[PDB]
Amino acid sequence: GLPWYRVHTVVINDPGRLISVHLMHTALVAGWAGAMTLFEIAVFDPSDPVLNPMWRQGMFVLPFLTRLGVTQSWGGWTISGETSSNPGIWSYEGAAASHIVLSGLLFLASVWHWVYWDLELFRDPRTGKTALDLPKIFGIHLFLAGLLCFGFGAFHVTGVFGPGIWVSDPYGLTGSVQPVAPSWGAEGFDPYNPGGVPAHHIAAGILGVLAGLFHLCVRPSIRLYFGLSMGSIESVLSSSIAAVFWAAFVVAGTMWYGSAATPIELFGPTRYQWDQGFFQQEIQKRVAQSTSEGLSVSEAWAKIPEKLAFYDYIGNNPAKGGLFRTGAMNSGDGIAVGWLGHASFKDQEGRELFVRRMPTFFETFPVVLIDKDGVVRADVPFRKAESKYSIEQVGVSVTFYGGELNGLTFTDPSTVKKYARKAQLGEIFEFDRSTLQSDGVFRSSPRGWFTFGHLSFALLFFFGHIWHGSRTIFRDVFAGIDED
Amino acid sequence: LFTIKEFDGKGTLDSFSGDFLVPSYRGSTFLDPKGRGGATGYDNAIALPAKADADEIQRLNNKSYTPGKGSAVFSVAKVDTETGEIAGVFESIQPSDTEMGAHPAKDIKITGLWYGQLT
Amino acid sequence: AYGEGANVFGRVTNKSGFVPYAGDSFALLLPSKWNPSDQKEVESIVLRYEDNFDAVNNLYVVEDKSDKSSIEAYGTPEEFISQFGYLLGKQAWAGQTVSEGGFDANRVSNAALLGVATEKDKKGKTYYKFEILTRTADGNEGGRHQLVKATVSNGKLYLLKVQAGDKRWFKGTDKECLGVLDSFTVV
Amino acid sequence: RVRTVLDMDRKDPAKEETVKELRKDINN
Ligand code: CLA
Ligand code: CLA
Ligand code: CLA
Ligand code: CLA
Ligand code: CLA
Ligand code: CLA
Ligand SMILES: CC1=C(/C=C/C(C)=C/C=C/C(C)=C/C=C/C=C(C)/C=C/C=C(C)/C=C/C2=C(C)CCCC2(C)C)C(C)(C)CCC1
């Protein structure tokens, strides 16, 4: 009479059916990978890599497929924006079909390993009872894991046999799948240095092999064997749950903060690029350099790439989103069509005014136009009676350099107020919202959703470590206690 | 706003008619449920940081508080000369609340009785 | 200093509530609880302080060159205060309204001149003193009291303006505002 | 030639939290 929450304990003491259920979970995961890839390819728009990349459309597995080398498709389109001459069998559709067929094969193998559960391999040769030599199993599977880690690091990513991984410029303007040379110096521990990824996966992998050869040759000591409850599968479950939630915390942190393994051309910008003005400073530095060359403001701003300006927009901030604001970023805000340009606000005196940008914390932010010396010179007041820094009172005009509105100046207060309100969000873009019926509230980029999901899983699996490990240590008393 | 403000009527003693001012139902400083309004207000649907366009021109910044006019007719029924007081019936037609210009006004007809004292 | 020692069983420094301040050519007393402020609504503002609690309570000193030889050259004090009509803010609203009580048609703000006068000084200097009450359609803090003290010396007009909410004015900000107005002394 | 002082004075009004302002702030 097992309660509904204990049913899957039936395979605790059955190695064969444990293999079967683990095969079934593996088959389900592979099937989900294939199906998700197929759905994403079906609903993906590859026409415009600029202003409409993958992270704008809510793609979740496309970033990873592109990160590890798969770029082309059988539909004739490349994620980089070129033409697919010969995508080969390793296109997105190829990966989806492969993971799907693997899921089916694992389903069949699960059926078999379930029917023929009573294999003599799982019998203890001496006693004849069913038993698993957990130290030796860990040694074998760790040796395999280390071998695979070294192989992936040395051949893949380095491009010796594999294709490499996604490497981009610091500002995410020109990124592509490239081979990576390992970084053997201290800079190999720079999180944003790509060269660490091969070298690590090499060196660590090597250690794994050696570690395997130890945990496969040397039997654990009796004191350690009974202390760590080696020989109980639930102890292994507790330790594995702990390790996996540790890894989940690490990956969530490394994606929220960004690293060489989570490029912004695949997951979108981080919130710390908006907070610290990572792109705004670069744009203004390029503009200033062009001006120092003698160019006018219009030419200097026309020289700015549209993708770089698009990164400098608060709508792409992963932290400007909602828990139930579902779907693609294009579903909340319209599909980007073009860059309006750069708005320069100037009072009737000629003093240049800058619009205070919305911080990541604020859902709504009042519009303030600030002097170069940090002195508020204009605003859109909430109380139009006896206002002091009104747009009409100060006489603010907005001139657009570059983009769609190039060399266009607006002086009517309504248009100036509208454009200042738009510019408080960063660079101003035109959005087509009729196509997807965008409501008008920002969604979160795929890196935000990934971080949220895997952080919640990390917490729940910390509770899993606690529970399954308590059950491990207190196995004798978890069938009941004999009073004191 | 049932009002008779500045009713400048003319006509005979049996029945005199005229027009009167009908102020906006809501003052300029009145804030809509989302903070929009004339004078003190937002002039923008800040709850949609990507929707402030011409599809919502009537609701945003078109808080038109323009006063309207209404028509009234008064008939004198009884007069007390010694007291100097008069009373009678009145009929008035005035527009409804326009909700600061959001939707068209509806015609309201109001009949009733009126009283007053002379000098 | 690091080895100065505490003030156990000591005595306070000052409890008057006002602290001195020396300007370019003027002396003033500011409330202790009022903090210095950075914003300059008028480019000629040379000093500004603001209340810590209610930012409506503030004051600023404006020093700008004047062609008039003396403050009397502006004319009558009422004419002078009519000259500086922009200090009371600007009505950005431009809609036809008649549904606001106590205000003229199409107006949402109104300034009432409670009184004007002329003051003296230890050197015989003449100061134009003004008290205004500005009300708005929303009635923010039940109106605002404005105290203005203006003088002309060495070709420059010095104008101190103190603003206090009526809600704050009723419950004891009048003392601080009047102290600020009284302490304003120019060479 | 870029005027770093003007660059910082441009970033500060739009965003005071910019890494341009905070870097070598005590030097200013
Ligand atoms: C890979 C990790 C892992 C593994 C292999 C196990 C394995 C096991 N757990 Mg454990 N557990 C885990 C993680 C894990 N757990 C975590 C992270 C938590 C914290 C939330 C728990 C908390 C927990 C409790 C409180 C208990 C167990 C119990 C058990 C045993 C019986 C499970 C059962 O039959 O329930 C049956 C499951 C169902 C009837 C279906 C429930 C449906 C859930 C609520 C939603 C469906 C999830 C969805 C379909 C899949 C998405 C999950 C995925 C994305 C992670 C079993 C050996 C029980 C035990 O101790 O045995 C005596 C028990 O009491 N677990
Ligand atoms: C951790 C794994 C993970 C992550 C990070 C994502 C992330 C994402 N997915 Mg995805 N997906 C996943 C797993 C994941 N998915 C799985 C396992 C499936 C198979 C079912 C799908 C199937 C799927 C589809 C079909 C689609 C996406 C889409 C998306 C993107 C839209 C954002 C979003 O999720 O909306 C918001 C997410 C939520 C609001 C979920 C909130 C979680 C709550 C708290 C759960 C609480 C449930 C509650 C207890 C039960 C009561 C509710 C009841 C009344 C119904 C986004 C980047 C969409 C897309 O962009 O198209 C390309 C899309 O259409 N996903
Ligand atoms: C010269 C060889 C070499 C090189 C170049 C590298 C290079 C690198 N290693 Mg590697 N490593 C090597 C050898 C090498 N390693 C060897 C021989 C081993 C032993 C097998 C390892 C084991 C190892 C591990 C376990 C990890 C790395 C990681 C990394 C990356 C660190 C940078 C980063 O951003 O992650 C940052 C990593 C961290 C900040 C880890 C700190 C996590 C803290 C301590 C705990 C946080 C979670 C915990 C549960 C607390 C709860 C959260 C709290 C808020 C409640 C980096 C590229 C890390 C990685 O994979 O990057 C994602 C990683 O964790 N290495
Ligand atoms: C048969 C070989 C095979 C191959 C070649 C691939 C290839 C691929 N898979 Mg797939 N997959 C496979 C099997 C395979 N898979 C199986 C059997 C399953 C079922 C479990 C899945 C389930 C699956 C899912 C759900 C997804 C993929 C995805 C992908 C794509 C991106 C992979 C990636 O970058 O993730 C990254 C890989 C890692 C981060 C590996 C992490 C290694 C951990 C951290 C090790 C830590 C513990 C370790 C043991 C410590 C050892 C100690 C040390 C000293 C050695 C890629 C083309 C993704 C995709 O893009 O969709 C198509 C996707 O989401 N796969
Ligand atoms: C309903 C029955 C059921 C199901 C569905 C599972 C399912 C699972 N068990 Mg499990 N188990 C069960 C019953 C069950 N168990 C019972 C009754 C016991 C005795 C108490 C155990 C004891 C047990 C132990 C001791 C362990 C598991 C582990 C696992 C996970 C590894 C799957 C695997 O081995 O395939 C193949 C493995 C792979 C293909 C490698 C990848 C595995 C992940 C889950 C695939 C998804 C990839 C992910 C998205 C990214 C990878 C990064 C990550 C690996 C760090 C898996 C999710 C292992 C684990 O992971 O601990 C959490 C583990 O150590 N189980
Ligand atoms: C509140 C958190 C917490 C709690 C209560 C437990 C509790 C338990 N754990 Mg678990 N564990 C945790 C977190 C936790 N763990 C974390 C974050 C990890 C890393 C993934 C693990 C990994 C882990 C494994 C692998 C195993 C356990 C096991 C166990 C059980 C045996 C007792 C034990 O060894 O504990 C854990 C011991 C400690 C928590 C000691 C930590 C004290 C360190 C040395 C402090 C380091 C200070 C450091 C210098 C500070 C500098 C860092 C700073 C700069 C940030 C027990 C019930 C064992 C088990 O399941 O029994 C069968 C087992 O196999 N744990
Ligand atoms: C049999 C076989 C085959 C195959 C077939 C097929 C077609 C398969 C596929 C299958 C599939 C197609 C699979 C899939 C699956 C899926 C999954 C497995 C998923 C699930 C989901 C989930 C679990 C989720 C949950 C949730 C939600 C809902 C909400 C939020 C939260 C979460 C996310 C948690 C072949 C031919 C090879 C041959 C051989 C045999």
Task: Report which of A360, A275, A334, A319 is spatially closest to residue A445, judged by C-alpha positions.
Answer: A319
* B contacts of C93 (beta carbons < 8 Å): 28, 38-39
How many beta-carbon pairs below 8 A join chains A and C? 45
Beta strands in A303-416 (DSSP E): 335-346, 352-355, 368-370, 376-379, 397-401, 408-410
- The minimal CB distance from B39 to the residues C93, C96, C98 is found for C93
Structure tokens at C90: 């600007």
Bridge partners, residue A355, by sequence: A369
| Sheet arrangement for strand C58-65 | C34-36, C45-51, C58-65, C156-165, C144-153, C127-136, C109-119
Report how far residue A19's alpha carbon sits from residue A16's, in angstroms, rounded to the nearest whole number.
5
Which single residue is written with the structure tokens 């009509």? Answer: C85
C-alpha dihedral sign at A19, A22, A24, A29: negative
Could you tell me the two tokens for D23? 């870097």
Amino acid (1-letter code) at residue A75: G
CA–CA distance, A263 with A175 (Å, rounded to integer): 9
- Distance between CA A164 and CA A69 in Å, rounded? 6
Report how far ligand 1's centroid is from the alpha carbon of A458 (Å).
14
> How many residues comprise chain C?
187
The answer to whether A364 touches B46, Cβ cutoff 8 Å, is yes
With beta carbons under 8 A apart, name residues in chain B contacting A316: none
**3-state SS string over chain C?**
CCCCCCCCCCCCCCCCCEEEEECCCEEEEEECCEEECCCCCCCCEEEEEEECCCCCCEEEEEEEECCCCCHHHHCCHHHHHHHCHHHHCECCCCCCCCCCCCCCCCCCEEEEEEEEEEECCCCCCCEEEEEEEEEECCCHHHCEEEEEEEEEECCEEEEEEEEEEHHHHHHHHHHHHHHHHHHCEEC
**Chains touching C by CB (3 or more pairs below 8 Å):** A, B
A13: left (phi over 0), alpha (psi -120 to 50) or beta: alpha
Contact C168, C56 (CB under 8 A): yes
CA–CA distances in Å: residue A101 to residues A94, A106, A108, A148:
11, 9, 11, 22
Nearest CB partner across the interface for C109, out of A385, A388, A390: A385
The number of angstroms, rounded, from the C-alpha of C162 to the middle of its chain's C-alpha atoms is: 2
Within 10 A of D26 (CB to CB), how many other CB atoms are there?
4
Establish whether residue A25 lines the binding site of ligand 5, counting it when its CB lies within 6 angstroms of any ligand atom.
Answer: yes
Q: Chain A: residue nearest B61 by CA?
A: A414
Tell me, using a 6 A CB cutoff, whether residue A327 lines ligand 3: no
A249 Cα to the center of ligand 1, angstroms:
20
Q: Per CB distance under 8 Å, which residues of A are interface residues toward C?
A: 374-376, 381, 383-393
B63/C96 Cβ within 8 A: no
Phi, psi angles (nearest 5°) of residue C59: -155, 155
3 state DSSP class of A55: helix
d(CA A424, CA A331) in angstroms, rounded, equals: 21
Q: Is the CB of A249 under 6 A from ligand 6?
A: no
How far from the centroid of its chain's Cα atoms is residue A478's Cα? 41
Identify which of A149, A200, A457 to mutate to test ligand 3's pocket (most ligand atoms within 8 A of the CB): A200
3-class SS at A46? coil
Write b or e for each residue in C114-139: b if 16 or more Cβ atoms lie within 10 A of its Cβ, otherwise e: eebeeeeeeeebebbbbbbbbbbbbe
Q: Candidates A157, A190, A250: which one to mutate for ligand 3, based on the most atoms within 8 Å of Cβ? A: A250
For chain C, the distance separating the N- and C-terminal CA atoms, rounded to the nearest angstrom, is: 37
Chain D contact set for A276 (CB, 8 A): 17-19
With b for 16 or more beta-carbon neighbours within 10 A and e for fewer, the A146-166 pattern comes to beebbebbbebbbbeebebbb
**CA A458 to CA B41: how far, in whole Å?**
45
Residue of chain A with shortest Cα separation from C40: A375
Residue B44 — φ and ψ, nearest 5°? -165, 145
The alpha carbon of A185 is separated from its chain's Cα centroid by a whole number of angstroms, namely 27
Whether B90 contacts B112, CB under 8 Å: yes
Contacts C97 to B, Cβ<8 Å = 24, 27-28, 38, 65
Method: cryo-EM
Q: Is A434 on the interface with B (CB under 8 A)?
A: no
Which ligand is closest to the CA of A472, given by its number?
Answer: 6
DSSP string, A115-136: HT---GGGB-TTT-SB---HHH
Number of alpha carbons in the 13 Å side-chain half-sphere of residue B10: 0
A252 CA: distance to closest CA in chain B (Å): 28
Picking from D1, D3, D18, the nearest residue to A280 by CB comes out as D18
Count how many Cα atoms sit within 13 Å of the Cα of residue C131 in the half-sphere of its side chain: 10
Give the integer Cα–Cα distance in Å for C45 and C59.
10
**C-alpha–C-alpha distance, residues A78 and A94, integer Å:** 14
Question: Would you report the helix, strand and coil content of chain D in percent, each value rounded to 5?
Answer: 55, 0, 45
- Residue in A278, A280, A292 nearest the CB of D14: A280
What would the 3-class secondary structure string for A176-201 be?
EEECCCCCCCHHHHCCCCCCHHHHHH
CA of A96 to the centre of ligand 7 (A): 12
With an 8 Å Cβ cutoff, the interface of chain C facing chain B consists of 93, 95-100, 108, 136-138
Question: Taking Cα atoms as reference points, which of A311, A359, A365 lies closest to residue A336?
Answer: A311
Q: What is each CA distance from A39 to A4, A329, B92, in whole angstroms?
A: 33, 17, 66
Query: For ligand 5, is residue A250 a contact (CB within 6 Å)?
Result: no
- Alpha-carbon distances of A187 from A184, A194, A200, C162, rounded to whole Å: 8, 10, 12, 60
Contact state of B25 with C99 under an 8 Å Cβ cutoff: yes
CA distance C34 to A350: 33
User: What does the alpha-carbon distance between residue A92 and residue A80 come to, in Å, rounded to a whole number?
Assistant: 14
Torsional sign, CA C119, C125, C126, C129: negative
Query: Chain B partners of A379 at a C-beta cutoff of 8 Å?
Result: none
Which stretches of A312-445 are DSSP H helices?
329-332, 391-394, 413-423
> Letter for the amino acid at A333?
D
CB A11 within 8 A of CB A21: yes
Of the CA atoms within 13 Å of residue A431, those in its CB half-sphere come to 28
Contact call for A383 and B52, based on CB within 8 A: no
- Provide the β-strand partners of residue A98: none
For chain D, helix (H) and strand (E) counts, in that order, are: 2, 0
Using a 10 angstrom Cβ sphere, with 0-12 exposed, 13-18 middle and 19 or more buried, the burial of residue C106 is: middle
Burial of A337 (0-12, 13-18, 19+ CB in 10 A): middle
Residue/partner pairs of C141-145 with CB below 8 Å, 24 or more apart: C141/C56, C141/C165, C141/C166, C141/C167, C141/C168, C142/C166, C142/C167, C144/C56, C145/C169, C145/C174, C145/C177
Q: Report the 10 Å Cβ neighbour count for A249.
A: 17
Instruction: Record the tokens describing residue B109, joined without a space.
Output: 């007809």
- Asked if B50 lies within 8 A of A441 by C-beta distance, the reply is yes
* CA A453 to ligand 2 centroid distance, Å: 9
Measure the CA–CA gap between A460 and B114, rounded to whole angstroms. 75
